[PDB]
C-alpha cells in the first residue's frame, strides 16, 4: 500500500534502464514476500518431536519448507514468468471480480489465504492459472525433449572409445583421449586437495 | 498385462510380429531402447532381439 | 559505467519527426510548412547565438523536423548538448538547428536537420532511386546514430561477484567485494573497446560471437559453459559437455 | 422508451441472515432452469422445425443453362441451350421408422432396436418441388414447360435422442424405463450403426466482427458476415495490408476464389470513383488536422498508386461499367474465352447483371443485400479499414484470440446444419441436374410431357444418392462438425461430454491451452486433460453457464429505429459523426444509426430488460468505453449465467453530498449531519432462498422481478462483480467500490470440478486430476445396461454417497465407496503411489 | 446563389443526341429494367430520399468520367501517350495545335464536385438533379462553341462520343435480352441466384513443428500413462 | 494528399527545381503553396498519447468498472473519484461525473 501511495503521489521515480511500469512491478514482487519470520507461527503451533508433516519435510522424505507454509500459513504471490498476473480481462482488469486499475495486490495474484483456510473464488483462480502452467509443461517436458534428444543422438552416436582411448569418427579425432583423463564416469570420487 | 511367446503372428512386408495385445503380436523394443542397449554395449541382446526375435534372416551377396 | 554503456539510439528521444520539403529562409520571407511557421521565431535566435555555426551555400530542399521527448531526456539523463553534438560528429553532411532546452512545460525543445547537397552526391551505386527515396534513408540513419553506449546491449546492471586472488603471503582468498556489469545484449568488439572495461575478461554467454573474434578453441570452452548453465545443479559430469 | 417498474427501496432490504448455503439455491435454481444439457435439445429442435426448412426452402434454388446437344432435326438445330431452373416448395422430417419386413407398412423403430441391430436411429425427409424448364433458340425464340413434384421421401436425418422426433418424446419415464432406456438420462446423443455419438459444441470466432491480427502482409483484418440467422450463408473478408503498401480486399465464399482485389477497386464498382470520398469513408473527414488522419492518409495514399499485375488494365478506369466486366470475367469459371462474346451487346449485359447480383449478395451481406444498400456497404467497409489503420499505428492491440467476447459455442444444430449445406447439394441438387441433362439429350425438349418431367426427377434420386444423404450425415457424426464416440463410463462422464467445448507455432499451442481471464463463470477453470497433447484443449461448461439461442432480430432492431435518440444511418454524415462526437450503435453486428449519448443509451435498454417485456433477457447490451460504441447481440452461441444484480443509493448519497456542501459554504457547522451513508446491496432474500427448495420460485420469476440478470462474457466486461454474499456485505457501505452484480462462488467450477470436497482447500492442478479420476471411476455406468451390448463396460454392483458430499451429487449419481482409510507405514507396501487393501 | 432545375437542357440534350429524354433522366436507375421500357419511361424509380441512395454515386460516376475523358482532350501534349479515345481525334494534328487545346477550350467544372456534395447531404432529390442537369450543361458547352473555327468540328466530335460512351455504358448494365448462351464457351452458364455450383468448402467453414506432439519419442501409445505427471 | 479539381483524383508528387508539382492521370498538373510541404511523417509512443484515450478519459465517471478513490471532487465536492492510471509511466489520472480532471484537464 505504501508502493501505491507513492504511485498516487508520483513519487516513484525509475532509475536509468526501467520504465516506471517495471519499477512498480519490481517494488510490488519484493514487497509481497514472505519474511523468514513466517515459520515463527509455524513452528509454534507444530511439536517437532511428534509432527509427521514436519518429520516428512525436515528429514528429506517428502516435502519442502514452502509446501508446509503455503499448507499453514500463506501462499503469497502467484508469479508466472517472473511476473504477477497480466491484466488480460478487457484492458486493466485481471478479473471481473476486480475494477480497472485497480491498486490492491489481490488483483495481480497474491493469495493471502492458506489451503487450509481455503481460498476464495478469486484465489482459486490465480491458482488455477498458475496450476495450469505446470500441466502445460509437463506435456511439453516429453515432446520438447524428444526432439532434442533425437537430434543430440545422432550427432554423436558415431563417437566411439578406440584402442588409444581416444574418441573418433571412424578414423577422425573427436578426442584425443576420451574426457581429457581416459576415465569412466561411474569411477569417480570427489577428494579434497 | 501381456506376454506373448516365441512366435505368432507376423507382418508379410516386414517379416517383424504384429503389433500389440490386439493382434496377438509382440511388444515395441524402439529406437530408443537400441540407444540405452547401444550405450551399455549389450550387441549379443540386441541380436538376440532385433535379430534373433524380430526379423533376423541370411542375406547374400555376390 | 553500466548507465554509461547503454544503448540510446537517436530514434528513441524522438516524439515525432517530419520530413519537410524547405530549403533555409535566413529571412523571414521564404515558404515554410504552415504547421511550423511558428519554428522561424526560435531560429533567429540560433543565429544570434552561433555566429561560427552559419548555413552553408550547398543546403538542399529537404528538412527533417524532429519533435524530442522530455520525459525521455530526463529519465535517461540526456543533455541537449550531446544529441546535438553526437549528430554533428556522425553526420557531416547536414545542417542542424535547435531550440533551448527549456525547462516550462507544454514549450517543446525541436531538432532541424537541413540536409546539404552532398547528401545526393553519394548514392550513386542505386541510380533509380530519386531525392525523395535518398532523403528517407538520410532520416532512417539520422534516427538509427548512437547517442550513449555501445550498439547491441539494450540494459547494463551491476552485479556481485566473488573471485578469488593469491595475497602476498601466498593463500588464496575468495574477494566478496567485487562489481561487475552484467549487459543484456552481445558485442564483444564493442564492449573491447571501452578504456573503463578489462578486455582480456570479457564474458560473452554468445557461442558465435566468441566464435568469431576469440577462435574455435574459445568457442569450446564457451559451448562447455553455456551447456552447462542450462543443465543447473544436477548437470552431468564435465566429461560429457565436453 | 423509458423504464416503467420502480422496485422498492434498497435501504429496506433484509439480507444479513443469508447463508452462503442458502445461496446454493440459486445455482439450483438456475440448473433447473437450464436443465444440463438442454440446450443441446433445443439446437437440434430449432434445426427440424426451422433450419432445414429455411435452408432448403431458401438456400437452394437452382438456376442452371445447359448447351443443348440434340442435332437431329431443324428444331433441334435451331435449340441451342436449355434452362433447367427449379426449387424446393415443402420440407418435412419425421420420427425413424422400419420396415419390420413383413411386406406391410413401417412401424416405428426404437433406439434399442438401432443399437442392437446397428440401424441408424434416422427419419424420413419429404421433399416438393417445382420445376421451370426453358429452351432457347438461334431467333431468340423461348419456350418454358412447368411441372409440380409431389412430396417424395429423399433420405433420412439422424434423429437426436429425447429430441422432438425421438421416439422417447411421447412416452413417460415408465415406459422409457421399460423398453430398454435409460430413464433418468436426458438424451442429446445420435445413434449410428450400433454406436452412440455426440456432436460437441464448437468454438468458433464471433461473426459479424473484425478480427485483426499481425501475421509479405504486414497486418490482417478477417471479418466473416452473415445476412442474420444461424442457418444463413457467411462471407469472409480479408482486408491484408502488405509490405508493398497496398491494401487488398479479397472476399471468399461459395463464388468468389481467393482473389485479391485492390482496395478502392470496391469502392468504384459501386459508383463511388472520386478518390477525395473514398478517403473519406476511411478517416471520415478529409477536413481534419488530427494526427491520426495524418497516419490515415498518408498510407492510403501510397496504396492507391501501387501496381497490383492482376488489376492493372482497370487500375486507372474510373468507368463502373468496365471495372464489373473485368471482374465478371476473372470470376465467371464459364468465361474461357474473352473477347468471342463483347461483339454482343446482350452478354455483356449477362455478365454486368450475374456480377452486379452476386456482388450485392456477397459483399458485407449482412448489411443488406439489395442494390440500395451499396453505399452503406461502403461506409462500413471504409469504417473496417479504418480499425485495421489504428492496430497498424499501435494505437489498438490486435485481436484477444484466447478471449470468449468475441467466441462462440455451436452445437448440433448449427453444425449439423453446415454439413447438411454442403451434403444437400452433392447429394441431391447434383443427382437432379445430372438426370435432366439425360433426359434432354436422349429426349427432344419439345416431346417432353409433364409426366416425362416428374419421372426423370424421381427416377434420378434412385437408391445410389437416397443413401449418400443419410450416410454422408452418418460419415459426418462419426468422422468429426466436431464429433466423439458416447463413452459411458459412468453418468458424471455421460453429462461432462454433452457439455464439452472443443476447438478446431509455439508461441500459440501454449496461449491455447491456459485459462483465460474471460472463463470464470462460463468455463471450468478446473477442468482439463492432465497429461498428453489434450492438456487444456478441451473446455468444460460452468455449472450455471449456458449456451443461447437466436433471438427476435427483427424485433429489437424495429425498436431501435423508432427510437428518438437514435439517428439512422441514412441521415447522419461522416463529418456528423467525427464532428459532432456521435456514437455508432450495432445490432448483431450491423451498423444502424448512432446516438449522441452511448452511456446513457446502454443503460436505458439494460433498464427495459429488466422488466422484459420491451427487450429481451437474453439480450446482450455491450458499451464499449474505449471508442464509444454500444453493441447489441442476439444470436445463437453466446455462453450466458445468471447474475444477481447489486443496487445501491448512489442517487440519494450524492444528493446528500450536495446538500453537505450547500451547508458547509454558508458557514453551517452541523454540515456533516447531511451526508448520508452508502449501501449497497442483492434484492435475493432468505425467503426467496426458502421459496426456490419448495419449488414456488424459478430462475425466470428471479429475472422477472430484476433481481437476477443473464450476462454474456461480452457483456461482463461492462460488469463488475462481488465473488460472493460475505463480500457484497463487507462493502455494503464502501462507496468506492459498487457491484453491479453478485457472484455465488460454487459458478465457477462444471460438474466434475464440484465433486471434489472442499476443493479450495486442494492444491488447484489436483482439482484438475480429480476431474479425469472423476470420469473415469467405476459405477453404474447405465441404469439399462442389462439391455445393451458394449464393449469395455464396467458396472460397480456398489455404490455410496459420500459422507461429506457435494451439489454436483445431486445431479450426477455417485461412483465409489466411503473406503476407511488409515495414514500410516505399514511395512513399506504403500510407497511411491501403493497402497495396502484389506482381502476381506 | 438560388439555383434551379432546367429540364429544357435535357431535352435540348436529347434533342441532338436523338434519344428519349427519359434516357437521360434515368441515368443509374437502368439497372434491372428493359432498354425498352426505360426508352418509353416505365418503372422509372421514384426520387431519392436518402443520401446513401447509390443513384447519387452513379450518375456523379457519370459526371467525372466526362470530365476526366475532357481533361485528357484538354492535355493531349502532356500524355507521352495519350489514350485510345484521343489519338485518333487529335491524329490529323500539328505539334503547335496539338499543345494547343488549353487555351481556347472550356473549363467546365466550376462549381461542381462543391455543389454536389451540398446537395448530396442536404436533399438528395435535388443533387440527382443538380448533376443530371450538370451533364447536359456540360455538353451543351461543348457543342455551342464557334471560335475558332479549327477546334469546333473536334471538340463537337468527342461531345457525342464521350456522352454516348457514358450513357452506352449505362446502357449495358441494364436487363440483356436475347443471345446465345454457349458465346462464352464452356458448356454451361451459370446465373447469380443458381445454388448448383456453389463451392463446397465455403459451407463448412468459418467464412512448423507440433510442440506437444511426441513425433520423436518413441513410446508405445498404451504405455502413455508412464507420462502422467503425478 | 492532393486531390485534382475535375476528376477528384489523388494526385502523383514530383520535385521540379524547388518546386513541388502534382500531376494527374487526366493530364492535369498544378503547384502546392504551403501545405503539401510534408513528405513524410512519423509519430512514437502512438499506444500511450493524449488523443488515444481522450474519449476513455472522458467516459471514465461513468463507466462502473473504474476503480475508485476517496478523494473529495474540488469542484462540486463530491467525496470519491474515480482513479485511471495511463501507460507505461503510470500516469494517475483522477477525475469525477461533474467534469473535473486532475492534470487539469
Ligand atoms: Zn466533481
Same mark, same amino acid.
Request: a neutral charge; proline letters at 4%; charged letters at 20%.
Given at each position: ?193 | ?62 | ?14 516524439? &515525432? ?36 555555426? &552559419? ?17 525521455? %531526456? ?22 542542424? %538547428? ?63 561477484? %566473488? ?5 602476498? &603471503? ?50 569450446? &570452452? ?21 | ?339 468471342? =462474346? ?179 463463470? =462460463? ?245 484438475? =486430476? ?71 | ?230 | ?105
Amino acid at each position: 500500500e505504501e508502493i501505491n501511495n507513492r504511485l498516487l503521489h508520483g513519487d516513484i521515480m525509475p532509475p536509468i534502464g526501467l520504465t516506471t511500469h517495471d519499477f512498480y512491478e519490481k517494488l510490488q514482487l519484493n514487497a509481497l514476500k514472505f519474511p523468514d519470520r513466517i515459520l515463527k507461527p509455524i513452528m509454534n503451533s507444530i511439536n517437532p518431536e511428534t509432527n509427521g508433516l514436519f518429520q516428512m519435510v525436515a528429514t528429506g522424505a517428502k516435502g519442502s519448507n514452502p509446501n508446509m507454509i503455503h499448507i499453514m500459513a500463506g501462499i503469497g504471490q502467484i508469479e508466472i514468468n517472473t511476473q504477477r498476473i497480466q491484466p488480460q480481462f478487457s484492458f486493466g482488469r485481471t478479473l471481473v471480480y476486480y475494477p480497472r486499475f485497480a491498486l490492491e495486490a489481490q488483483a495481480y495474484g497474491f493469495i493471502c489465504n492458506s489451503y487450509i483456510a481455503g481460498l476464495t473464488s478469486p484465489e482459486f483462480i490465480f491458482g488455477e492459472m498458475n496450476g495450469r502452467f505446470d500441466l502445460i509443461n509437463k506435456a511439453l517436458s516429453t515432446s520438447s525433449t524428444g526432439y532434442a534428444n533425437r537430434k543430440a543422438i545422432f550427432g554423436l552416436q558415431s563417437c566411439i572409445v578406440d584402442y588409444y582411448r581416444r574418441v573418433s569418427i571412424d578414423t577422425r579425432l573427436v578426442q584425443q583421449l576420451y574426457g581429457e583423463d581416459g576415465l569412466d564416469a561411474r569411477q569417480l570420487e570427489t577428494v579434497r586437495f | 498385462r501381456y506376454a506373448v511367446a516365441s512366435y505368432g503372428p507376423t507382418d508379410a512386408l516386414t517379416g517383424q510380429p504384429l503389433d500389440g495385445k490386439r493382434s496377438h503380436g509382440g511388444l515395441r523394443l524402439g529406437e530408443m531402447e537400441h540407444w540405452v542397449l547401444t550405450a551399455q554395449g549389450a550387441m549379443q541382446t540386441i541380436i538376440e532381439k532385433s535379430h534373433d526375435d524380430s526379423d533376423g534372416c541370411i542375406s547374400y551377396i555376390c | 559505467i553500466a548507465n554509461s554503456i547503454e544503448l540510446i539510439t537517436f530514434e528513441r528521444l524522438i516524439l &515525432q519527426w517530419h520530413l519537410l520539403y524547405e530549403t533555409y529562409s535566413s529571412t523571414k520571407k521564404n515558404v515554410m510548412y504552415p504547421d511550423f511557421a511558428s519554428d522561424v521565431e526560435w531560429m533567429t535566435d540560433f543565429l544570434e547565438n552561433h555566429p561560427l555555426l &552559419q548555413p552553408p551555400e550547398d543546403i538542399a530542399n529537404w528538412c527533417i523536423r524532429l519533435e524530442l521527448n522530455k520525459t525521455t %531526456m530526463i529519465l535517461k539523463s540526456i543533455s541537449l548538448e550531446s544529441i546535438i553534438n553526437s549528430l554533428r560528429a556522425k553526420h557531416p553532411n547536414t545542417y542542424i %538547428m535547435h531550440s533551448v532546452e527549456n525547462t516550462a512545460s507544454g514549450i517543446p525543445i525541436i531538432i532541424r536537420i537541413y540536409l546539404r547537397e552532398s547528401a545526393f552526391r553519394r548514392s550513386t551505386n542505386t541510380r533509380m532511386a530519386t531525392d525523395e527515396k535518398i532523403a528517407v534513408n538520410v532520416v532512417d540513419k539520422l534516427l538509427n546514430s548512437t547517442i550513449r553506449g555501445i550498439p547491441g546491449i539494450k540494459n547494463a546492471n551491476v552485479v556481485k561477484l %566473488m573471485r578469488h586472488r593469491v595475497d602476498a &603471503q601466498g593463500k588464496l582468498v575468495r574477494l566478496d567485494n567485487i562489481y561487475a556489469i552484467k549487459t543484456n545484449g552481445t558485442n564483444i568488439f564493442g564492449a573491447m573497446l571501452d578504456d573503463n572495461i578489462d578486455p582480456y575478461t570479457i564474458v560473452s554467454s554468445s557461442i558465435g560471437d566468441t566464435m568469431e573474434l576469440y577462435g574455435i578453441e574459445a568457442a569450446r &570452452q564457451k559451448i562447455i559453459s553455456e551447456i552447462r548453465t542450462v543443465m543447473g545443479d544436477k548437470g552431468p559430469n564435465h566429461r560429457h559437455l565436453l | 422508451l423509458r423504464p416503467q417498474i420502480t422496485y422498492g427501496p434498497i435501504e429496506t432490504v433484509d439480507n444479513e441472515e443469508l447463508t452462503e448455503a442458502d445461496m446454493l439455491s440459486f445455482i439450483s435454481a438456475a440448473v433447473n432452469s437450464t436443465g444440463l444439457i438442454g440446450y443441446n435439445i433445443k439446437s437440434f429442435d430449432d434445426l427440424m422445425d426451422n433450419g432445414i426448412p429455411q435452408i432448403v426452402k431458401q438456400m437452394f434454388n437452382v438456376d442452371i443453362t445447359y448447351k443443348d446437344q440434340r442435332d437431329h432435326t431443324e428444331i433441334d438445330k435451331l435449340r441451342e441451350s436449355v434452362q433447367i431452373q427449379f426449387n424446393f416448395t415443402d420440407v418435412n422430417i419425421e420420427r425413424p421408422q422400419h420396415r419390420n419386413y413383413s411386406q406391410g407398412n413401417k412401424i416405428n423403430l426404437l433406439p434399442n432396436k438401432a443399437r442392437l441391430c446397428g440401424l441408424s436411429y434416422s427419419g424420413p425427409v419429404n421433399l416438393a418441388a417445382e420445376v421451370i424448364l426453358t429452351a432457347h433458340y438461334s431467333n431468340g425464340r423461348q419456350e418454358v414447360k412447368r411441372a409440380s413434384i409431389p412430396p417424395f421421401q429423399v433420405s433420412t436425418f439422424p434423429i437426436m435422442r429425447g429430441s422432438n422426433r425421438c421416439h422417447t418424446h411421447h412416452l413417460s419415464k415408465t415406459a422409457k424405463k421399460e423398453i430398454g432406456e435409460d430413464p433418468n438420462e436426458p438424451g442429446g446423443y445420435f445413434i449410428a450403426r450400433g454406436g452412440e455419438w455426440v456432436v460437441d459444441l464448437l468454438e468458433n470466432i464471433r461473426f459479424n466482427t473484425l478480427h485483426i491480427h499481425y501475421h509479405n502482409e504486414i497486418i490482417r483484418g478477417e471479418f466473416i458476415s452473415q445476412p442474420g440467422g444461424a442457418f444463413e450463408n457467411s462471407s469472409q473478408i480479408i482486408i491484408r495490408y502488405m509490405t508493398t503498401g497496398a491494401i487488398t480486399i479479397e472476399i471468399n465464399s461459395t463464388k468468389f476464389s481467393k482473389l485479391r482485389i485492390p482496395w478502392y477497386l470496391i469502392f468504384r464498382m459501386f459508383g463511388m470513383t472520386g478518390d477525395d470520398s473514398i478517403i473519406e469513408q476511411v478517416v471520415f473527414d478529409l477536413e481534419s488536422n488530427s494526427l491520426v488522419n495524418t497516419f490515415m492518409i498518408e498510407i492510403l495514399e501510397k496504396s492507391i498508386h501501387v501496381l497490383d499485375p492482376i488489376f492493372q488494365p482497370v487500375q486507372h478506369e474510373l468507368n463502373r461499367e468496365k471495372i464489373i466486366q473485368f471482374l465478371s470475367e476473372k470470376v465467371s469459371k464459364f468465361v474461357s474465352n474473352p473477347s468471342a =462474346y463483347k461483339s454482343d451487346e446482350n452478354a455483356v449485359q449477362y455478365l454486368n447483371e450475374r456480377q452486379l447480383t452476386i456482388l450485392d449478395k456477397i459483399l458485407l451481406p449482412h448489411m443488406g443485400q439489395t442494390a440500395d444498400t451499396r453505399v452503406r456497404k461502403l461506409r462500413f467497409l471504409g469504417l473496417l479499414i479504418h480499425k485495421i489503420l489504428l492496430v497498424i499505428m499501435n494505437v489498438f492491440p490486435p485481436t484477444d484470440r484466447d478471449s470468449y467476447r468475441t467466441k462462440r459455442v455451436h452445437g448440433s444444430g448449427v453444425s449439423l446444419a453446415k454439413a447438411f449445406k454442403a451434403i444437400f447439394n452433392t447429394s441431391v441438387i447434383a443427382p437432379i441436374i445430372n438426370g435432366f441433362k439425360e433426359l434432354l439429350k436422349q429426349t427432344a425438349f419439345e416431346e417432353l410431357t409433364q409426366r416425362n418431367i416428374i419421372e426423370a426427377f424421381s427416377a434420378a434420386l434412385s437408391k445410389n444418392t437416397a443413401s449418400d444423404l443419410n450416410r454422408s450425415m452418418e460419415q459426418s457424426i462419426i468422422s468429426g462438425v466436431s464429433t466423439q464416440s458416447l463413452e459411458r463410463k459412468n453418468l458424471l462422464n455421460t453429462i461432462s461430454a454433452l457439455r464439452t467445448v472443443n476447438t478446431h507455432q509455439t508461441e500459440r499451442a501454449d496461449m491455447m491451452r491456459r485459462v483465460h481471464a474471460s472463463y470464470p463463470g =462460463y468455463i471450468c477453470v478446473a477442468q482439463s486433460a492432465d497429461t498428453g497433447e489434450k492438456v487444456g484443449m478441451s473446455k468444460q461448461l460452468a455449472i450455471t453457464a449456458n449456451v443461447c439461442t437466436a433471438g427476435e432480430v427483427l424485433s429489437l432492431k424495429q425498436r431501435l429505429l423508432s427510437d428518438p435518440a437514435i439517428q439512422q444511418l441514412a441521415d447522419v454524415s461522416n463529418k456528423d459523426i467525427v464532428r459532432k462526437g456521435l456514437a455508432r450503435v450495432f445490432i448483431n453486428g450491423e451498423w444502424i444509426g448512432c446516438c449522441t449519448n452511448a452511456f446513457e443509451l446502454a443503460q436505458r435498454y439494460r433498464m427495459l430488460r429488466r422488466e422484459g417485456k420491451v427487450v429481451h433477457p437474453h439480450t446482450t447490451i455491450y458499451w464499449d468505453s474505449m471508442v464509444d460504441e454500444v453493441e447489441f447481440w442476439l444470436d445463437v452461441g453466446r455462453l450466458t449465467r445468471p447474475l444477481l444484480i447489486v443496487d445501491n443509493n448512489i442517487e440519494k448519497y450524492n444528493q446528500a453530498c450536495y446538500k453537505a456542501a450547500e451547508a458547509r459554504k454558508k458557514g453551517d457547522k452541523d454540515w456533516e449531519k447531511h451526508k448520508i451513508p452508502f449501501i449497497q446491496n442483492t434484492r435475493f432474500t432468505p425467503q426467496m432462498a426458502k421459496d426456490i427448495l419448495a419449488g414456488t420460485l424459478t430462475l425466470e420469476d428471479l429475472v422477472a422481478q430484476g433481481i437476477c440478470e443473464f450476462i454474456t462474457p461480452e457483456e461482463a466486461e461492462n460488469c463488475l462483480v462481488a465473488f460472493s454474499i460475505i463480500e457484497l456485505r463487507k462493502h455494503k457501505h464502501d462507496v468506492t467500490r459498487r457491484f453491479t452484480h453478485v457472484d455465488v462462488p460454487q459458478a465457477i467450477l462444471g460438474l466434475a470440478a464440484l465433486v471434489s470436497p472442499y476443493a479450495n482447500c486442494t492444491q488447484p492442478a489436483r482439482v484438475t =486430476y480429480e476431474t479425469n479420476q472423476g470420469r473415469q471411476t467405476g459405477g453404474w455406468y447405465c441404469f439399462s445396461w442389462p439391455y445393451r451390448v458394449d464393449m469395455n463396460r464396467f458396472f460397480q454392483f456398489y455404490n455410496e454417497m459420500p459422507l461429506v458430499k457435494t451439489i454436483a451429487h445431486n445431479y450426477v449419481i455417485p461412483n465409489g465407496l466411503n473406503t476407511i482409510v488409515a495414514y500410516m507405514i505399514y511395512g513399506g507396501y504403500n510407497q511411491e503411489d501403493s497402497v495396502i487393501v484389506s482381502q476381506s | 446563389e438560388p439555383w434551379t432545375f432546367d429540364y429544357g437542357k435535357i431535352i435540348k440534350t436529347a434533342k441532338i443526341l436523338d434519344i428519349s429524354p427519359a434516357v437521360i433522366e434515368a441515368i443509374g436507375a437502368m439497372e434491372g429494367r428493359s432498354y425498352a421500357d426505360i426508352r418509353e419511361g416505365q418503372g422509372a424509380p421514384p426520387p431519392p430520399t436518402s443520401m446513401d441512395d447509390p443513384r447519387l454515386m452513379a450518375v456523379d460516376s457519370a459526371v467525372r468520367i466526362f470530365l476526366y475523358n475532357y481533361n485528357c482532350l484538354r492535355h493531349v501534349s502532356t500524355f507521352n501517350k495519350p489514350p485510345i479515345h484521343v489519338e485518333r481525334l487529335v491524329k490529323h494534328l500539328s505539334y503547335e495545335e496539338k499543345e494547343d487545346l488549353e487555351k481556347v477550350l472550356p473549363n467546365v467544372v466550376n462549381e461542381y464536385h462543391t455543389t454536389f456534395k451540398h446537395l448530396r447531404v442536404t436533399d438528395p432529390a435535388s443533387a440527382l438533379l443538380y448533376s443530371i442537369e450538370f451533364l447536359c450543361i456540360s455538353f451543351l458547352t461543348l457543342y455551342e462553341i464557334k471560335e475558332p473555327s479549327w477546334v469546333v468540328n473536334i471538340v463537337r466530335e468527342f461531345a457525342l462520343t464521350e456522352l454516348n460512351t457514358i450513357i452506352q455504358s449505362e446502357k449495358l448494365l441494364s436487363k440483356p435480352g436475347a443471345f446465345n448462351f454457349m458465346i462464352f464457351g464452356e458448356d454451361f452458364v451459370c446465373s447469380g441466384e443458381d445454388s448448383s455450383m456453389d463451392d463446397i468448402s465455403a459451407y463448412s467453414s468459418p467464412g512448423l513443428d507440433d510442440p506437444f506432439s511426441i513425433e520423436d519419442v518413441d513410446i508405445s501409445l498404451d504405455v502413455l500413462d508412464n507420462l502422467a505427471p503425478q | 494528399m492532393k486531390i485534382c479539381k475535375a476528376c477528384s483524383s489523388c494526385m502523383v508528387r514530383t520535385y521540379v527545381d524547388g518546386n513541388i508539382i502534382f500531376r494527374c492521370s487526366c493530364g492535369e498538373s498544378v503547384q502546392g503553396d504551403s501545405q503539401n510541404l510534408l513528405v513524410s511523417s512519423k509519430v512514437y509512443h502512438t499506444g500511450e498519447m493524449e488523443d488515444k484515450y481522450k474519449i476513455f478519459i472522458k467516459n471514465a465517471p461513468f463507466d462502473p468498472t473504474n476503480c475508485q478513490i476517496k478523494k473529495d471532487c474540488p469542484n462540486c465536492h463530491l467525496d470519491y473519484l474515480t482513479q485511471i492510471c495511463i501507460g507505461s509511466q503510470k500516469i494517475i489520472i483522477l477525475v469525477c461525473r461533474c467534469g473535473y480532471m486532475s492534470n487539469r484537464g
